[PDB]
Design a binder for this molecule. Sequence first.
Ligand SMILES: [Mg+2]
Ligand SMILES: [Mg+2]
Ligand SMILES: [Mg+2]
Ligand SMILES: [Mg+2]
Length: 52
Amino acid sequence: GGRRHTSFSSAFVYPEVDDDIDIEINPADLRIDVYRTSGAGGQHVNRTESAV
RNA sequence: CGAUGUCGGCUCAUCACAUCCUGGGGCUGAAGUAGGUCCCAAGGGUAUGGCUGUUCGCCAUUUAAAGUGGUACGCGAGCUG
Ligand SMILES: [Mg+2]
Ligand SMILES: [Mg+2]
Ligand SMILES: [Mg+2]
Ligand SMILES: [Mg+2]
């Protein structure tokens, strides 16, 4: 029993065009701190500053 | 290898200067206050705690600053385990 329907539709547009991705992995930043581990491998792992 | 005992903490330190603070200066994108940077300088000073066995670290609250390291990563014929 066809009656007047008031239906809608959306049309969103966007370019989506880029080539610029910056991780900023420049080592002027990124302070590095080295320390030793908890220690389970005897005398060696407590002496080696392995963690970072 | 017919013995050179090991991290951390406590204690006691001592020297180096690539100096965290105080002192003396240059330069400044230094008006002033407050900072940045570099040079000279080691005389003295150079946190208390929550969490972890932890050094470190994170966090809270300060302080003029809560320096970086060597010293069997100082110290078990001194201690803890
Ligand atoms: Mg000034
Ligand atoms: Mg304590
Ligand atoms: Mg602490
Ligand atoms: Mg000891």
